[PDB]
Design a binder for these strands. Sequence first.
RNA 1: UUGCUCAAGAGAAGUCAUUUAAUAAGGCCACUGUUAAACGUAGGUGAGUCGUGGCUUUAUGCC
Length: 216
Amino acid sequence: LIQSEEYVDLTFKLRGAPIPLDNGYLTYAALSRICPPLHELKSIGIHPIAGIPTRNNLLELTAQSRLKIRIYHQQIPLIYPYLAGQAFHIGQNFYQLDIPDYKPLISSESVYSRLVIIKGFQDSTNFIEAVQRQMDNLGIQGKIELLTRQDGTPQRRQLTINKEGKQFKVRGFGVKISELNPEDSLTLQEQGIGGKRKMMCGIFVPATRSKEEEET
RNA sequence: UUGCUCAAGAGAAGUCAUUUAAUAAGGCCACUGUUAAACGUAGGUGAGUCGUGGCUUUAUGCC
């Protein structure tokens, strides 16, 4: 019920050809090529693109599909002229961004992260204690829950970094976090957890997306 | 047993051979969607994969 200050969500309407469901390095590299200053930013995150799933491991862009960026509201003039109204290419297709809209950061008792990556922690228990430690660093208190598939197993995801000729394997979990209170909820939403924040993973969102991800 | 009792209009046959509805035609010439305005002030979101790889002190974050 508390709208966070100093942090906003820059949302660009996204249109173009269908894209892989694991954009990650693809979208990040495209934006970095379009926006050189995006590479050197620190406290910025790119939202997972919202669109229905299509065949293979691709993702189809709808009219509601939009590129959303979480950024310090004073750092917008560093990337706005490079992104607002410009176009970026994923693979061989051209994608166009229009004038973005600002969305405030709302507090929620239960928050969700579709993907959390911590280096060197692959099992569930070590990952859980690592996220507890990360909460301890930021001084946030809450109960950690892991998103599960239809079989109840904790859900894992993989990030493919196509750096140079070799392709890289970075993997993590998707967690659901509640019992946060609005202040710590906003703190976790801005700060995020884990690494690879610009890599379309590690940021947070309300638990409605948690249930939606649980559905499929 | 009925002005009746019985009783095949039956056999066979190409409507055929040939013919351009053809020669010619501009839907054409003309039109202003003219003239004027303070944004005042308060309307929200749809979804994968499975066990360390180049930096960096395991850390923990970058590609």
